[PDB]
Amino acid sequence: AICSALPTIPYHKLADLRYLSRGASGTVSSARHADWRVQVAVKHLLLDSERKDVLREAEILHKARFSYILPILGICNEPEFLGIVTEYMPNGSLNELLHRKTEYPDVAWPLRFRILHEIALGVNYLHNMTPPLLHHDLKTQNILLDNEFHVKIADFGLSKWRMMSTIIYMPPEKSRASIKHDIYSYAVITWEVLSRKQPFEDVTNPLQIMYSVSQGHRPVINEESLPYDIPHRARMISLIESGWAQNPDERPSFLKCLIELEPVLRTFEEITFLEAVIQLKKTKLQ
Amino acid sequence: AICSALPTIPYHKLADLRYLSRGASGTVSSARHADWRVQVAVKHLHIHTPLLDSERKDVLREAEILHKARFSYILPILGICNEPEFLGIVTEYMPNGSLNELLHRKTEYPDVAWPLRFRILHEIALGVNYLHNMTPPLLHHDLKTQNILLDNEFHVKIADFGLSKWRGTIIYMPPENYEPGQKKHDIYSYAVITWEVLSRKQPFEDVTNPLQIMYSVSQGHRPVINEESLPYDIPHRARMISLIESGWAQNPDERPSFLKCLIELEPVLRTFEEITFLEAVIQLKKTKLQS
Ligand SMILES: COc1cc(NS(C)(=O)=O)cc(-c2cc(-c3ccc(N4CCNCC4)cc3)cnc2N)c1
Ligand SMILES: COc1cc(NS(C)(=O)=O)cc(-c2cc(-c3ccc(N4CCNCC4)cc3)cnc2N)c1
Numbered sequence: 010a011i012c013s014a015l016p017t018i019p020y021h022k023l024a025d026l027r028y029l030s031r032g033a034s035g036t037v038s039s040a041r042h043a044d045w046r047v048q049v050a051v052k053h054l055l056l057d058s059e060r061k062d063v064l065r066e067a068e069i070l071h072k073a074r075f076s077y078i079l080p081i082l083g084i085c086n087e088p089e090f091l092g093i094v095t096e097y098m099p100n101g102s103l104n105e106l107l108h109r110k111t112e113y114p115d116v117a118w119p120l121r122f123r124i125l126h127e128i129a130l131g132v133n134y135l136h137n138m139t140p141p142l143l144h145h146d147l148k149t150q151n152i153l154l155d156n157e158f159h160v161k162i163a164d165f166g167l168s169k170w171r172m173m174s175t176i177i178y179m180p181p182e183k184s185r186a187s188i189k190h191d192i193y194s195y196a197v198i199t200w201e202v203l204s205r206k207q208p209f210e211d212v213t214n215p216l217q218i219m220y221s222v223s224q225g226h227r228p229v230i231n232e233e234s235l236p237y238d239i240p241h242r243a244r245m246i247s248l249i250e251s252g253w254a255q256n257p258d259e260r261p262s263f264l265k266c267l268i269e270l271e272p273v274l275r276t277f278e279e280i281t282f283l284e285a286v287i288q289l290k291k292t293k294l295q
Numbered sequence: 296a297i298c299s300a301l302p303t304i305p306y307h308k309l310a311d312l313r314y315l316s317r318g319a320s321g322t323v324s325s326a327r328h329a330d331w332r333v334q335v336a337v338k339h340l341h342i343h344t345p346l347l348d349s350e351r352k353d354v355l356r357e358a359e360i361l362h363k364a365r366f367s368y369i370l371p372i373l374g375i376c377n378e379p380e381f382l383g384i385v386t387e388y389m390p391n392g393s394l395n396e397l398l399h400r401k402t403e404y405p406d407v408a409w410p411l412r413f414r415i416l417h418e419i420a421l422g423v424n425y426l427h428n429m430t431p432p433l434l435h436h437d438l439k440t441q442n443i444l445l446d447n448e449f450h451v452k453i454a455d456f457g458l459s460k461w462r463g464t465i466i467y468m469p470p471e472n473y474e475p476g477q478k479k480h481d482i483y484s485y486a487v488i489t490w491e492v493l494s495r496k497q498p499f500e501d502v503t504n505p506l507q508i509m510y511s512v513s514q515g516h517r518p519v520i521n522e523e524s525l526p527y528d529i530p531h532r533a534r535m536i537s538l539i540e541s542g543w544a545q546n547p548d549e550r551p552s553f554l555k556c557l558i559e560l561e562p563v564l565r566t567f568e569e570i571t572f573l574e575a576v577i578q579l580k581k582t583k584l585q586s
């Protein structure tokens with residue numbers, strides 16, 4: 010009954026456009042809104058089909074608003090520019106946090122587990138929509154972190170509306186159920202977050218990754234990839250291994266993951282998150 | 296062109312309903328969404344007497360307003376509860392209450408670091424300015440320290456839309472609204488809120504009768520500005536006092552736009568380092584415990 014139109018942001022109101030990153034789908038730049046006095050991020054690419062792609066992603070973000078989804082502030086739809094405008098995330102992506110070990114020599118476990126929990130919450134919300142929305146392109150580069158390192162899921166270019174129950178996060182290719190797609194990616198992201206290593210480190214051609222996963226093989230789980238000092242390491246490993254099970258029916262729902270995670274996160278006090286973020290921003294200086 | 300329908304939340308999925316507050320505009324309770332696994336706040340009317348279609352229209356108007364005014368510093372609405380046996384607006388849960396509690400519960404919050412105060416002021420200005428930039432422009436007309444919620448890291452979220460339902464809070468009403476001849480409202484409220492945040496005092500503290508407060512304000516009087524209410528060791532004290540006194544000018548035409556206030560506030564907030572904010576918030580959260 011209650012319907013909301015996505016605001017149309019005039020391009021001329023976006024000032025100080027500066028390149029932040031160039032990806033497969035577009036270019037993300039920071040900017041300042043002249044009227045609202047806030048900083049925004051602009052993702053821009055035109056063939057009418059790709060214009061439809063951009064508009065489709067904008068509408069999906071608009072309908073999928075939630076606490077852990079990148080909040081879209083508007084769409085810029087002009088003759089000379091087509092871009093999605095979202096909140097600006099000063100702390101980049103989960104990828105940077107996990108792998109730039111000079112910037113972030115230490116990332117305290119409480120922060121990692123809160124990130125994992127919030128990814129699970131956001132994706133569960135998506136899967137609980139009507140109809141359920143399947144993200145199908147989760148990766149540590151899609152997960153942005155706001156000023157206090159809370160998750161914002163992004164990149165909804167590869168998405169579907171029909172659930173029932175780069176490629177390093179893609180499940181292997183019988184009767185096929187693509188409801189269990191996101192959970193495989195989440196398993197890989199979990200292994201990544203807990204290991205701070207690149208999945209399939211020794212692989213030089215991504216097709217090697219496809220062949221290995223199709224053969225039932227996954228990122229290595231041993232003391233080197235996952236030290237034994239990981240909180241709830243056994244439960245987390247079980248979560249991971251069920252998440253990337255070769256059979257999609259063996260993979261849990263995101264609700265099961267939240268059920269399985271709640272005690273794990275409960276082991277940490279809420280203040281430790283803030284402490285870890287302050288340690289992060291202090292050691293990143295100097 | 297791009298339209299989003301506000302979700303309809305089944306009442307039965309709101310669990311552990313716990314009364315948080317009973318107010319002039321409604322009743323706020325905390326609850327937990329069985330599917331989303333998150334805590335939410337539900338604003339609902341009295342449960343006994345059937346809701347008159349005017350109250351139902353008010354609730355729908357508030358829900359749609361929150362939905363259309365979505366923004367970084369506005370209370371995020373997650374859905375509407377529209378059932379035979381319950382009608383409530385569902386929003387994100389703000390664990391840290393309102394700006395009023397932060398400013399005046401000095402045992403919980405003995406000290407509130409200046410960077411945090413100025414960030415709060417800036418974010419309030421941002422939220423109300425966004426509100427004013429909508430089409431049609433939305434005038435809040437009921438800004439107060441009770442409407443300003445603080446999320447888990449003490450970032451501002453403006454709340455309380457729709458109307459009021461009665462069937463202390465006049466310190467933020469300008470003197471030309473006392474008798475509403477239905478004719479630049481919010482900025483006065485913002486000036487008063489600023490004076491409060493920098494002073495951490497009750498405006499018109501020595502006045503026990505609000506009717507006397509209204510008389511004074513109609514006479515051009517405002518909260519006292521001296522060394523006792525605003526010590527001279529306050530950062531950017533002069534600039535902030537000028538902003539205040541211009542905001543609550545007797546003449547509404549003399550009060551500045553929220554855009555002017557944002558232009559003036561931008562350098563002030565610019566003097567603070569990003570780590571000082573995090574440190575202020577964590578210091579706050581730590582002294583709030585063990586107290
Ligand atoms: C819809 O438009 C998007 C999409 C996506 N996600 S995506 C990969 O395209 O699917 C992200 C953003 C976004 C990025 C950033 C951001 C902040 C810092 C950086 N860094 C670059 C190098 N390291 C230092 C800083 C990069 C990006 C901040 N806010 C944002 N809303 C905007
Ligand atoms: C849309 O529904 C609303 C409206 C409004 N604003 S309003 C005046 O009603 O228009 C606020 C909230 C809300 C309140 C709270 C909250 C939590 C605890 C407390 N308490 C602390 C202990 N002492 C007693 C008060 C008070 C409020 C936490 N989240 C929230 N979203 C929800």
